[PDB]
C-alpha cells in the first residue's frame, strides 16, 4: 500500500525531472556556466588591475624601506596603496602585482596539504551527558581543558601555573576517542586533530616540517587544542640497536618534543595524547612538563555499564520498559565499546526475529552471544 | 526439489484441507486449530516465504467452499482465521477483514505485525472508499478502530496509529488512549500536517491535538496551537485555566511576544505582571541588559558600519541616516544621533522630510522612555515635515509596544485631521504601525469615518487602508471592508493606473488575510469592484487575502494566470509575490518555489525579472544561503535598473540582521561596482543597514516558533513593503519611502534572556545547533548539531535550536525562545 | 660513530656533522663563537665531535639530591600562594628520585588540588597522591 | 502523514513546472538567442591558449593559480566558471593574457581504482556457492540489506556493522563469498591482499592505506576486502625491530580508518584471516569488527555440494561416481575440491579420452593430498 | 578537419600569435619440455572442443622459467616450426619505458594482431624485464610499466583461441594479478645442463661462419662441460676472434679450443 505509494510518486519524480532535462536542457561538458549571465567585464578589468603573483619577502632593509622579494626572479621593491609597511611582518606571501611591481596585498602562509586537510575544522557529533563509566577521569580532563578558559580568572587568582598537556591512555576501548570527540565537539578554540601516520613519511626531512608548520599554524591561531592520535605509532624508545636505519621516526619526535617545549615558548596549545598502551611512550615525551595530567580510563563498574547502556538504548524502537542494572550484572568486565555492540546485537536480533521492539529478551540474546564469542 | 521436511509439511497441510468439506470430530475443530498452530508457527517464523502459503492456492478456494458449507456454529470464525491469513497472502480484500475479524477481536498474537499493518489500511481504505453512508457498516469500522489503536499505541507504531486516524476522519478518537510516554509523538505528529487536507474542510487537527494539550495539561503548546487556530475565544479559553503561576507566565509571555491582546483587568491573581508582561513593558530594559551583557552601545559612522577608508545630496544623506538606523536599533546613539540628526537637518532637501526623524525613532525603537523624551525636547516647532517626524518617531516607539497609555495614538489622533496632506499622511502611518496588529476598535472608528480621501490624495487614502489593514491583521473586520468599499466608490478612472493604487488592495488583504474559505467572498466582493481597471490588484486583493497555505490549489491558478503571457505584467508580479505568500513554511517547498523562481526569472519577462526577488525576500527572509546570495547578486547586476533595485533590496532582507562576512563583503564589491548609480547606491547602503539591523540583533521572521508559529503583524508588514517594491522606480524613488519604517515596527528579534522567577536573569549554558527535524529519526534526536556551550545570553540563528544542558534546571518551554523561565527544580543531580 | 652503514639519510647526516665540525676546526680562528651543546644520549656520539677543540668543558647534570629537590620544589613554589606551613624538606625526602620537571608539574597539579576547594594550604599528602591487596 | 507530504508536494512539482514550462516552450522564443548570445560572450571570454593548475583557493572570486613554469600567480575568478569543481590539485583554465580562472578539467585519475578492481562481478554467485548457508544469511545481514534496505536500520534506530571478519583455515571459500558478494551487491567491491601494503620504506604502507580507504569512502559505499593481516602487525609486540615497529604503525592507521577520530561513510570491511587467535586483540574490538564467522571446512554433505556445484559446468560420465571422493574424511577444501575437478579433467584429457573416468578422479585425489 | 583523423597523439602546427592549430603536421634433450608445452599450447588450439564437455575454459597462458642461455628459445623455435598458427615474437623488454604513452598502442597492435592471426603464439621472451613482480611504488597510481601492465590485464580479462606464452630468466619475481585466475595460468621450468642441448645450440649458434670440416663439435661440446647457453653463442664469437688472429678464415678445431679454453 504505502510503499506502491512511494514507487509510484518517486516513478513521477523521475520522470519529471527527466523531463526537465530533457526539455530545457542545462550541462557543462567541459567548463561550464550553468549559473544564468555571470558577466564579468569589470572582474576582467580589475583583474587587468590585478592578478598579482606572489613571492616570499625576506627583508626590510631601510626605515621609504627596502623589501627582498624571491622567485624565479629576485627583486627588491618596495612601496604600495597597501598599508601597515610589510605588516610588522617580514617572511609572509607578500603578493605584489607587476608592472613596476610595487603594489602588494598581504596573504597567509603556505602549508602542505597534509597539515591544510588535518586542521579538521568539522565538529564531531558528541556532547557531555553522554560518557558513563569514567566520571572522575571525565572531571579530570573538563576542569583542566575548560577552567583555563572558562571563567579563567578564579584559576589566575591562586597564583598557580595552568596545566598544558593530557595523556588518554588504558584498555583497547573505553571511551577514550569519544571523550576526545566530545571535548572537540563543546570547545570553541583551534582545534587540531593529529593522525600519527600522516608524519610518517619517504625519508628525512618530511616529518619535523609538516610538525613544525603545525606548530606555528597553532601559534598563529589565538588559542589551539590539539589532539594527537597514535601516538604510539609516532614517537617510541630513543635507543638505536638497530633502528641505526630507523632513526627517522626518532628524529621526529626529538623535534615534535623541542616545539613542544624549547628555548622558547610553546604558546596556549593545549596537547591531547590517545593511547592504549602508555609504556612504550618515550620518557623524555612523558616527562610532566609537557603532559601534565595523564588520565586513566579503566573498565567501567555496574553504575558505569547501567549509564551507557541507557546512552546506547537513547535509540527509539526499544522496549517499553528494560532492567539496565541488570544487563550490566550479566556483562562484568564489558567496554563500553562492547555495551555499544550489544545494543547493535539487540538491533539485529530484533531484525532477524522481524521485530520492531528491542526486548530484554533480544538484549540478553545479545549478551549470551557476546559473551560466548 | 524442496526439502523432504517441507514436502510432507504441505502433504499434511493440504491433506487436511480436501479432508475439510464438514464439520465432524477432527474436521472442525481440532484440524482448524492445527491449520491455526501452522499460522502462528508462521508469523513466528521469518518473513522467508512461509512454508503452508505460495502453495496452498486452490486452497484458499477449497477453504472458502467449506466455509459456505459448514452450518454456523463453533465455527464460521474459527476457519475464518486461516481464510483471512489466506486473505492476506492472496486476496480477500474487505471480506476477510470483516467476517474474521469481527471473530477473535484484537488480541493479534498468532499473526504478528504485518498482518496488523495490512488489516489497518484495509479498515482505512475501506471507509476512504465508503462515503457518507453505510453508517450499519460505519460502527463495525468504529469498533475496528478501537481495537487496533492501543495495540498500534503499545507496540511502536504510533505514527501508523496517526496514519490510520487521520485517513479514517478519527481524530476525537485517541483522546481515550494516549499515554503520557507518547503525548510528545503524537502532538509532534499532529504539527506535522504541511498537507492539513482536513484543514480546508476544518481545523480537526488542531482540535483534537488541543484536547490532548489541554487534558495533559501542557499549556504553553496548548495555547501555541490555540494561537495557530485563528480563534482568540480559543485562545482566551486555554490561557484561563492559570492553575500555575510559572506556566501563567510562561504564557503570558508567550501571548505577548505574539502580540495578541490579552482582556481581563483587576480580577484574577498576577494580574498586573501578567498584564505587564503581556504588554511587553520589560521588552527594552531586558534587550538593553543583555546588549550590555558582551556591551554593544558604540554608535558606528555609516563608514565604519562600511568600510570604505579600505580604498553629500539627500540622496546619500537619507541613505547613511537608513543605514544608521538599521545598525543602531534601539541601543540609544545619544551622541552620534544628535551628529547625524544636525546633519540631515541641515540637508533637509526635497525628500530630506520627516524620513530621518522616522529614523531616530527606529534608533530609539521600543525606547519608550529614551526615544519619546529625546524626540519630545529635540523636535516639532515649524516644518510640517519634522511635526509629522516627531508623529511617525512616536508611532515607531510605540510600535509592538502595548500599554493603556496612548502617547502614539493621542498624538496622532490629534493631528490627524490637519490639513497639511503630508503630514495627515504621516500621523495616520504612525497610528497604524504604532498598535500594528492590536486590532482593537478606537482608532478604527477613528480612522474609518476619515478614509473618505475625496479632499486628500489617493496616497493617502491608500496608507489610511495600509493602517486599518494593520490593526485589523485578518479579522476581516467589516467596516474595514465598507471602508474600502466607499474608497472604491471614492476610486477614479486613472488614479488605479498611476502609482499606490495597490495600498487599498494591500489593506483589504491585510484585513482577509489567509483566512481560509472567506476567500471565496472576497472573490466575490472582487468581482462588486467591477471598476474600470486592469485587474492586477484585484490580484493582489485575493493573493493577500489567502496566505499561510501548504497546499497549491492556489498556487497553480496563480502560477497560471502569470503564465498567459501578458506581451502590464504586474499582474503576473503579483502572482508570483502570492505564490510566494503561499509558501512561507514547508522547506522543501520553500527551495523549490525559489527554484520555480529562478525559473521564472530566466524564461520570463523583464516585469516577471522584476518581481522574482522580492519573491525569493519573501521566502528566504533573514536566511541569507549562499545559493540564494549568488541568484540575488546575479540578478541584481542585471541591466534593468528596476530588477537590479528589486534584487539588491531583496539581498539586503535575506541578509538583514544577519551580518556574514560574506554576504558584506559581496555588498560592498557591488556598492564598488555601482560607483556612478545613484539611487542603485542609495539602496544598496539600505542592503548594508538591513545587513546589520540593530548590529545583528533584531530580526523581523514570519515564521515563528521552531517554524511554527506564524507572525501575523510581521507578514502584514513585509507584504506592505514588498508590494511597494513591486515598483521600485515610482513607489519609493520619489516621495514616499517610509513603508520601510512600517517594516521596523514589523520587527523583531531573536534571542534567549533566561529570565527566571520574578524576572530574575538567571544564566544558564545552554547547547545551541542547527535544527535536525526531530520527527522519525532515532531515539531522542541531537537536535543541537555542532554543540557550541554559550551560557544564556545567545541569540540563537535562524534555523538552530537548543538543548541547555545535562539536568541543570527545568526549562518552562521544550521550544525556548525570547522570554523563559527556568524551574530551580532538577529531580536529581 | 659515522662508521655505520645502515643506509641513506644515514649519510646526510654524516656530512651536516662533518660540517659542523669542519666550522669550527678548519682553518678559522672562530674566536668569536661560543658553542653550547646539549644532548640526553650521552653515550652514543660521534667521537670527533666529541671534544678538545670542539666540545670541551663537558658540564654533567646529575640528579638532584635531597636538597636539590627541595631546592626545585620552593624555587617553583615561589609565587604559589603556599600557606605559612610547609614540610618542604621532607616533601623533598618523599620525592623518591623525583629528578625532573616532576616538581613542577606537582606544584602545579598541588594548585589544582587546592582549587578543587579555593584553598591556600598544602595539605601534604594529597601531595603526595598528586605526586605519584597482597601484603599490606 | 509523511506519504501525504511527499505526494502532495510531489504533484505540485508536476504540475508547476510542466505546465509553465511547456507554455513558455510553446512560446520558445527569447530563449535559444539568450543561450546563443551567453555562449558566445563566453567564448569571447578569452579562449587563446590557456591551461591552470589549482594550487588552492582564498574564497569566492579569489585563488591561486599555478603553471608548469610554477606561475603561481593570483587571480580573481570569473563567475563563469562551474564553480565548486574547484578542488585543489585541479586542473584549471586560465586565458592566456589575464589568467582568468575560467574553465577546469581533469577528466583522468590515478588508475589505482582500476587496478583494485578488477572483474568486480565474478564468474562465482551464491549459486556457485555450495552450501554454508547459515555464513551466507549473517554476511548478508551483515553487508547487503543494511545496503539494498536501508530501512530496516534507520527506522529501528541502530547503525549496521562496520567490520565483518571472516576466519579459517587455508582455503574455506573466503574469497569466493567476497566475490559473490561483490557481484550480488551494487556498490564497487575492492579487492585487497596482505602482501602488497608490506612497503619497502617508512610511511608508504600506512599512506596507501590511507589512499585505500579514502578511495574506498569516495567513489562508492561498497566493501574493502582485506585479505590476511596476520603476516601483518600480529597484535602490538615490544616494537624494537624497525620493519615490525613500521607494521605495527600500519595497523595501528587502519585501526584509526576502521573507527577514528571524525567520521566513517558507507563502507564496510570485510577481513579474511586463516588464523585468528594471533590478531591484535584491540583490533577486534567489538566497537570496529563485529559478526566473526567461523569459515571451516565442509562435513560430507557440504563436500557433495561443493563437488556438485564445481561440476555443474563438468560433464561427469555415466561410470563417474561422485561419491568415493567424498569417501575421504580429511581436509578437502572447496579449493581442493576444485583442484580435484580441475586434475581429473586434465588427466581425462591427457590421456586422450574426452569423457573422465572414476579412476582418473581417483589418481586426482591422490596427487592433489598433500598430506 | 574536426580531428577527423587526428587520434589524442600526433604533431600539429601552432600559429605563433593567437594560438591555432593549422596544417596538421603529420607523423636436443629438451623433449619433456618440448612435449608439455606442445600439450599445452596445441591442444587447445587444435580441438577447443576438449573442454566444452568438461565445462571449462581453453588454456590461454603459459609462462617459462630458463635459466640465462638455456631454454627459452629452442621451445620457441621448435613450437613456431611445428605449429602451423602464427607465431607473432614480441621478445625482450617490448614495452620499456623507452617509449612511454606510446607502449599502451603498440600493445593495443599487438592484441589487433593477435586477434587477426587467430590462433596466435604472441612469445614474449625475458617478461623480467617488463613484468617485474607488482610492488613498490606505482601499485596502480604509476603511468608506467604499471600502468601497461594494468592495461594488458585488463585486456586479457578473454582471449577466445591466441595464446601467450610470458618467459623469463627467475621466478622470484611475479605478479599476483596476472598470475591470478584468466590470465596466464600454467607455468614450466627449464633445465640449465644438456651434453646433447650445448652440442645442438653450439651448431646452430655457430651456423653462420665459415667452419672447417675435419672438426669434432662433439668434442668441443663435450670439453665445454660447464657451460651455459649464450656462453655457448660467447664461445663461437670467441673462436671467431681467434681464427682472425690466426689470420686465416678456416676456422679450425684449434681456434675451437683455443676459444673454449679461454672461456672456461
Ligand atoms: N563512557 C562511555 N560512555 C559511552 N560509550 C562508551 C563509553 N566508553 C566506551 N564507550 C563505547 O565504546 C566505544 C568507544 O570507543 P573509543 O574509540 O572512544 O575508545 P578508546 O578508549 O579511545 O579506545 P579504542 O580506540 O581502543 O577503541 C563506543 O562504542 C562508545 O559507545
Ligand atoms: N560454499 C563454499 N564454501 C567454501 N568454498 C567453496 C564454496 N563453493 C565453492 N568453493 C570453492 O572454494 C574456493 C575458494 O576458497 P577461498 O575463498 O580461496 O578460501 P581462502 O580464502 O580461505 O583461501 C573456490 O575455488 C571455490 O570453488
Ligand atoms: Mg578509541
Ligand atoms: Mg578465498
Redesign the interface.
Known sequence: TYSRQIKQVEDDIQQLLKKINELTGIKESDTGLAPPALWDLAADKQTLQSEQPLQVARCTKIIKYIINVKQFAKFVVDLSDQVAPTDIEEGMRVGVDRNKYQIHIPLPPKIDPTVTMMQVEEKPDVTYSDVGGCKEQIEKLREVVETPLLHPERFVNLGIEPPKGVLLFGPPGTGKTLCARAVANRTDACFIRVIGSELVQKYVGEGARMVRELFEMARTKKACLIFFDEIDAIGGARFDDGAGGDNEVQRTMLELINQLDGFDPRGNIKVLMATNRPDTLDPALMRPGRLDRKIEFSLPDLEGRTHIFKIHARSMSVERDIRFELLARLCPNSTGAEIRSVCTEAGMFAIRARRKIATEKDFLEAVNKVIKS | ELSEEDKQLQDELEMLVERLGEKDTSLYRPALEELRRQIRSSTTSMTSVPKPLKFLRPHYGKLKEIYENMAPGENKRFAADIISVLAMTMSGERECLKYRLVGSQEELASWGHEYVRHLAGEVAKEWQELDDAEKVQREPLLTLVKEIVPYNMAHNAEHEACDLLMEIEQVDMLEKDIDENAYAKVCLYLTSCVNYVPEPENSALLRCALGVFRKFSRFPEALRLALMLNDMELVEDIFTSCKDVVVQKQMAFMLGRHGVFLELSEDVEEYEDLTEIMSNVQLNSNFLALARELDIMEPKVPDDIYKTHLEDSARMNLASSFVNGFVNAAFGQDKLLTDDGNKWLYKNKDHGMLSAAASLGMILLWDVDGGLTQIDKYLYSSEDYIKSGALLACGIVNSGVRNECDPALALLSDYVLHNSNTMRLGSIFGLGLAYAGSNREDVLTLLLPVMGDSKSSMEVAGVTALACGMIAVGSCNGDVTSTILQTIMEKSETELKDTYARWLPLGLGLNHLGKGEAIEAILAALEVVSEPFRSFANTLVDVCAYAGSGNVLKVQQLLHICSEHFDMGAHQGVAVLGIALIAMGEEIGAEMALRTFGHLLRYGEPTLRRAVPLALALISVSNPRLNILDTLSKFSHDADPEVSYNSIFAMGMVGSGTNNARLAAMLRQLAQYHAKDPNNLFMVRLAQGLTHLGKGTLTLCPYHSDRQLMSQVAVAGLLTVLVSFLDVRNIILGKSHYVLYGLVAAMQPRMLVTFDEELRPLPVSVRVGQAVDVVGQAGKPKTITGFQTHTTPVLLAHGERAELATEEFLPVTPILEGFVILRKNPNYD | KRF?S?????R??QRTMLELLNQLDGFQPNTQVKVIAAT??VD?LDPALLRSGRLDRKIEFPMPNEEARARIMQIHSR???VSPDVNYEELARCTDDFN???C??????A??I??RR?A?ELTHEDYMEGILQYYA | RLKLLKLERIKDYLLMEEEFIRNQEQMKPLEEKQEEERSKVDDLRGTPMSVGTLEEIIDDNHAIVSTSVGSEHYVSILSFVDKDLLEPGCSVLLNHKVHAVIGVLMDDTDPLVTVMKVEKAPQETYADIGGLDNQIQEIKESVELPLTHPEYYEEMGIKPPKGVILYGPPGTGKTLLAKAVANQTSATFLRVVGSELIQKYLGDGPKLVRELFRVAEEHAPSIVFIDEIDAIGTKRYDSNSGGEREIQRTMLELLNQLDGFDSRGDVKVIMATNRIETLDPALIRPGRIDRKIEFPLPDEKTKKRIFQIHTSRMTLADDVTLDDLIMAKDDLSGADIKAICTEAGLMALRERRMKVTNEDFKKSKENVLYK | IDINDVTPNCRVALRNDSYTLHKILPNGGLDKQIKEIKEVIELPVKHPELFEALGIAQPKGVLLYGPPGTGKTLLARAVAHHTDCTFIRVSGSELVQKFIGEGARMVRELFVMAREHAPSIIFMDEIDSIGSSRLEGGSGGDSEVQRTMLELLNQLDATKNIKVIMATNRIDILDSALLRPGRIDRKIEFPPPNEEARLDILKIHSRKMNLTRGINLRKIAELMPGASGAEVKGVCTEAGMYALRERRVHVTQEDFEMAVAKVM
Open positions: 655505520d645502515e643506509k641513506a639519510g644515514d646526510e647526516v640526553n644520549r652514543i609565587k604559589m600562594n625532573g620537571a616532576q613542577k608539574a606537582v606544584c602545579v597539579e594548585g589544582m587546592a582549587l579555593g591556600t
